[PDB]
Amino acid sequence: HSGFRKMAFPSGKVEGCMVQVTCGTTTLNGLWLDDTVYCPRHVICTAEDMLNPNYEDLLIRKSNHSFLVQAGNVQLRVIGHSMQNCLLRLKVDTSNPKTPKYKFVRIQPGQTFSVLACYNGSPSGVYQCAMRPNHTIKGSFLNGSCGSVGFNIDYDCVSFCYMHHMELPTGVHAGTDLEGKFYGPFVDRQTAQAAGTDTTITLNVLAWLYAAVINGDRWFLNRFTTTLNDFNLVAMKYNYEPLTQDHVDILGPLSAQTGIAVLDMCAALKELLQNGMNGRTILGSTILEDEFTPFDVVRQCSG
Amino acid sequence: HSGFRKMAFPSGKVEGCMVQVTCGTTTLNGLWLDDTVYCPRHVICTAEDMLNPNYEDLLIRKSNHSFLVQAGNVQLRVIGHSMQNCLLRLKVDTSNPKTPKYKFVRIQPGQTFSVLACYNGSPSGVYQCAMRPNHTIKGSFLNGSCGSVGFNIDYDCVSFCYMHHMELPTGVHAGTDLEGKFYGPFVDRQTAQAAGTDTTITLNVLAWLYAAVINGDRWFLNRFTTTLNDFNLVAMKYNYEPLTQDHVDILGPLSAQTGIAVLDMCAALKELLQNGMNGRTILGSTILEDEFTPFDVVRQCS
Ligand SMILES: *[C@@H](O)[C@H](C[C@@H]1CCNC1=O)NC(=O)[C@H](CC(C)C)NC(=O)OCC1CCC(F)(F)CC1
Ligand SMILES: *[C@H](O)[C@H](C[C@@H]1CCNC1=O)NC(=O)[C@H](CC(C)C)NC(=O)OCC1CCC(F)(F)CC1
C-alpha cells in the first residue's frame, strides 16, 4: 500500500469566501474577496432567457437593489455592479475579513485543482479533479452548484482557477477562470455543446509510473530510450497528449529521485502502449491513472 | 447526470482546531477544542521509549511545562494534563473561539469519514477513508501526521471519530477514537503489527453499483434475482460481508431512485463475483469499490 492518494487542499480558506447571490428566485454561489463578489452572470437569467440570453440587455434592467447577496442569511448590500466576460463583479459594502492571500490563475490542460462544491452559499464537499485536454472537467455537480470554485493552495496563498457554469451532454462540466473567460470553446447558454474528443494526460501517466518505481514496482522499465519527437508521434496514435518542453522539465525532480531519465520512462510507456500490460498491474491497477500529477507524487513521498 | 467523485467534507471547521504539540524533540498535531488539546500520547516518548513504552511511567515524569503547544505563532499555556487510553488531554489557559459544535463518535466498520492530514500543526490535505472490517484504514500518512483527525459533519455539528497513531508494515494505518481507544488489535508501540484478514464491505459495493446506474453505467445489470440468504452464502464464500435486512432497508431510497430492487442489485453483484469484470470498468474502476456508503452516494447523486 503506497499511500499515494488523491487529496483535496484543505478548503477552509475558500469556505470563508463563499456567499449566495440571488436575483428573483434564481440563487447561485459567489466568491467574496475584499469588497467584491464574483459570480456567474447567468444569475440574472429567467427560464425564458436561458436558451439565448442577451446578457447586456438583461443587465440594463438590473440595479444594485436587484441583487441579494448573503453570507449565510446575513445580507451584504450591493453598491456597484458590472460584467466582466461571463462573470458579474458585485461591489459590496463590507470587505471580507476572511479574505486570504489570493491570486487568479488560468489553469492549463492536464493540471489539477480542488473543487469546493457549494449550494446556496453553503459548502457541501471538496474533491480533486483535473482540467482535461478538451477543456472540460469530470466534476460532480448538482443543480445550484454554479459559482462553486476550483483552487490550489501554495503555502498561505489561494490560487483561484475555476468557477463553475454548466454541464455538457456527456455529463462533464465547463466553466471559466476568475476573469470570466471560459476554458474551451463553450458559451454560457442553455444549449447542447459537444466537447472535443478527449485524450490521456501523458504527463500524469508518466508521474504515475515514477510513483510506481518509487514504491518498488519496476517490472515495466527497459534498457531502451526514445527521442521526444518519436515518442510524441506514437503518443498521438494512442490518443495520448504530446509531451511539451515544460512537461519534460516538470518531470525533472522525479527523474532525479529515481535515476530514470524522462526519455527512458517514455520508452517504458511506449512499450506498455504497444504491448499492453498483458495481465500485470502497476500500483495495484490494470489501467494507467492520468489525474495524479508530478507534484502530487513528490509531495507525498516524505513528511 | 451529476458525475461521481470521492468527496470529503469541507475541512474548515476542523482546520480551526489544529495545533502543534511538542514534548522534548517529538512533535505532532493536536486538536484544540474549548480549553483542551487532544493528542496521541506517544508525543512523550523518545526514540528508545517507543520500542516498549510504559506510558504511565513516562507521563508521571512530565509536568505541564514539558508540553509546548502552539497555535500558529502563539504559544498556549498548559495548565493541566491527563491521559485517557492512548490520548493525552492537555488543559490550556485559552479557549478556542473557533471550536465548532462537536461530538465524539466511535465509528463502525464500513462507515466512512474525512481525514484532514496535518503536519507541524498545519493542514495539508483532505481525503475520504473507510473503517475497514479488520479495523485498519487505507490512508495516506507520513512522518509527522500523528494527531490528524477523521470526522463527519452533519448540519453544523462535527463528529470526530478518528485520531491517527501509526502505520503497519503493509502500508495501511491504525489509530483511535477521541476517547483514545484503538480501533482493532493494535498497540501504540514501535513494532510490526499485522491486521486480521480483511473483508469487503458489501453494503458499500451495492451503494456504489447504484451510483453507477444513476450515472448511466449499467452493463452489469441482469434479469436474475436472488434471495437474501442465497446472496449471503455467495458473499461469504468470496469474503464479502453478509447483508442484513436492516442493510437492505438502508438501500431503499437508492432502489426507488433507480427502479432496481435491492435483491436484483444483489443478483448483479453475485454474477460479478462469480464471473469477474471481463476486463470492463464501472465508474472508471477496474475493481469493485467498497469505500462509499449509501449516504455518500445519496449526498452526491440526488
Ligand atoms: C506519527 O507519530 C507516526 C505516523 C506514522 C509514520 C509513518 N506513517 C505513519 O502513519 N507514528 C509512528 O511513528 C508510530 C509511533 C509508535 C510509538 C506507535 N510508529 C509507526 O507508525 O511505525 C511504523 C513502522 C513500524 C514497524 C514496521 F516494520 F512495521 C514499519 C512501519
Ligand atoms: C448552475 O448551477 C447550473 C449547473 C448545472 C446543473 C446540473 N449540473 C450542472 O453542472 N448551470 C446550468 O444549469 C446552465 C445554465 C446556463 C444558462 C449557463 N445550463 C446547463 O448546464 O445546461 C445543462 C444541459 C444543457 C445541454 C444538454 F441538453 F445537452 C444537457 C445539459
Author numbering:
A (entry chain B): 0 to 302
B (entry chain A): 0 to 301
Task: List passages from the publication reporting this PDB structure.
Coronavirus 3CLpro is a cysteine protease that has two N-terminal domains containing two β-barrel chymotrypsin-like folds. The active site of 3CLpro is located in the cleft between the two domains and is characterized by a catalytic Cys-His dyad. The polyproteins are processed by a 3C-like protease [3CLpro or main protease (MPro)] (11 cleavage sites) and a papain-like protease (PLpro) (3 cleavage sites), resulting in 16 mature nonstructural proteins, including an RNA-dependent RNA polymerase (RdRp). X-ray crystallography confirmed the mechanism of action of the inhibitors, which involves formation of a covalent bond between the active site cysteine and the carbonyl carbon of the aldehyde.
Next, compound 7j was cocrystallized with SARS-CoV or SARS-CoV-2 3CLpro, and the structures were compared to that for MERS-CoV 3CLpro and 7j. In the SARS-CoV 3CLpro-7j complex, the backbone of compound 7j formed direct H-bonds with Cys145, His163, His164, Glu166, and Gln189. Compound 7j also formed an additional H-bond with His41 and a water-mediated contact with Gly143. However, there was a loss of the three H-bonds between Gln195 and Ala171 and the fluorine atoms, compared to the cocrystal structure of 7j with MERS-CoV 3CLpro. The electron density map was consistent with both possible enantiomers at the new stereocenter formed by covalent attachment of the Sγ atom of Cys145 in the cocrystal structure of SARS-CoV 3CLpro with 7j. Compound 7j was cocrystallized with MERS-CoV, SARS-CoV, and SARS-CoV-2 3CLpro. Superposition of compound 7j with these 3CLpro enzymes revealed a similar binding mode among all three proteases. Compound 7j had a moderately lower potency against SARS-CoV 3CLpro and SARS-CoV-2 3CLpro compared to MERS-CoV 3CLpro in the FRET enzyme assay, suggesting that moieties forming H-bonds that were accommodated at the S4 subsite had an important impact on potency.
